[PDB]
Design a protein around this ligand. Structure first.
Ligand SMILES: Cc1cc2nc3c(=O)[nH]c(=O)nc-3n(C[C@H](O)[C@H](O)[C@H](O)COP(=O)(O)OP(=O)(O)OC[C@H]3O[C@@H](n4cnc5c(N)ncnc54)[C@H](O)[C@@H]3O)c2cc1C
Ligand SMILES: NC(=O)c1ccc[n+]([C@@H]2O[C@H](COP(=O)([O-])OP(=O)(O)OC[C@H]3O[C@@H](n4cnc5c(N)ncnc54)[C@H](OP(=O)(O)O)[C@@H]3O)[C@@H](O)[C@H]2O)c1
Length: 246
């Protein structure tokens, strides 16, 4: 039939005036791999409006959960800001994306680097039991401007205490637990991330995922290349995978 189904908003949590999570009903035949994104839409008059969102919830969960930054004057943000439980929302029948760490042949330490809402796919990746089994450590570095935007801080930090480490980065204000004042590319360059994790990072043992602001992705990729890392390819195992968070 159609390329999408009509689902319902099950709930909406307004963590801050600009940051929301929400959940939608999940058709039994909707399958995705941790790290992928859905396309969500609404009827817009006689037409549609569609956007991509990384699935935050686990592959095995019975709902679909998402995490959205409300963009000033954004068309989809405007709908998200007024949507309520019970509203109809459209779910494209197909999930997409290549942020798939199991494609890495080996590696001792998985390091996921994200900004803002780009944390979303890594939250779903964190639920896959085999990811934790194949990596000696799994690390998540999350960069936001202010600590109030670290909305998953409480539980990620609870999961950190085969090890899992969470390092918050706040670029425009201090945060006690993690790194403050500096963006991820510089924190890779000056050894701060390597020191924060207590794990030496090398091309031989470290595998990188990057998701977030496109300028951050380019800057991080360039920094890693200068440090001897390589892009994962169809025929080269490599040590870097990346996806623009928007
Ligand atoms: C593969 C992919 C995955 C995505 N996953 C998510 C997700 O999990 N969560 C999410 O919030 N958005 C996600 N986005 C972006 C999302 O699809 C929309 O762009 C976003 O919801 C804003 O839509 P809008 O209509 O309100 O404004 P738009 O017209 O779509 O965007 C206006 C501008 O706002 C900025 N912007 C848009 N989205 C973001 C963002 N999330 N963070 C920072 N700046 C942004 C950009 O400069 C953009 O040009 C993803 C985009 C892609 C391509
Ligand atoms: N949050 C911001 O600082 C900021 C700035 C300009 C516009 N906006 C707008 O505000 C809305 C919300 O955005 P957001 O804060 O969720 O997303 P964001 O602008 O992408 O910021 C999230 C994180 O990404 C970092 N970052 C940005 N560019 C980077 C780069 N080139 N290299 C490395 N790290 C980089 C930011 O550092 P910094 O804090 O140092 O930028 C911040 O830590 C969007 O409409 C966005 O366009 C936000």
């Amino acid at each position: 039939e159609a390329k999408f189904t009509e689902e319902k908003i099950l709930w909406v949590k307004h963590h801050t005036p600009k940051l929301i999570t929400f959940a939608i009903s999940r058709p039994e035949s909707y399958r995705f791999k941790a790290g992928q994104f859905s396309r969500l839409g609404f009827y817009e008059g006689k037409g549609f409006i569609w956007r991509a969102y990384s699935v935050v919830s686990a592959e095995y969960a019975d709902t679909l959960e998402y995490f959205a930054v409300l963009i000033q004057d954004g068309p989809m943000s405007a709908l998200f800001a007024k949507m309520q439980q019970g509203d109809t929302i459209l779910l494209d029948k197909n999930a997409t994306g290549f942020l798939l760490p199991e494609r890495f042949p080996d590696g001792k330490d998985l390091v996921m680097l994200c900004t803002g809402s780009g944390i979303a796919p890594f939250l779903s990746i964190l639920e896959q039991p085999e990811i934790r089994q194949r990596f000696d450590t799994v690390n998540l570095i999350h960069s936001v401007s202010f600590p109030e935007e670290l909305i998953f801080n409480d539980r990620l930090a609870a999961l950190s205490e085969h090890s899992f480490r969470f390092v918050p980065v706040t670029t425009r204000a201090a945060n006690p637990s993690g790194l403050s004042g500096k963006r991820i590319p510089e924190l890779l360059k000056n050894n701060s991330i390597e020191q924060a994790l207590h794990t030496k990072l090398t091309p031989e043992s470290t595998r990188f995922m990057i998701c977030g602001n496109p300028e951050m992705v380019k800057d991080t990729f360039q920094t890693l290349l200068d440090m001897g890392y390589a892009m994962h390819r169809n025929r080269i195992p490599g040590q870097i995978m990346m996806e623009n968070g928007f």
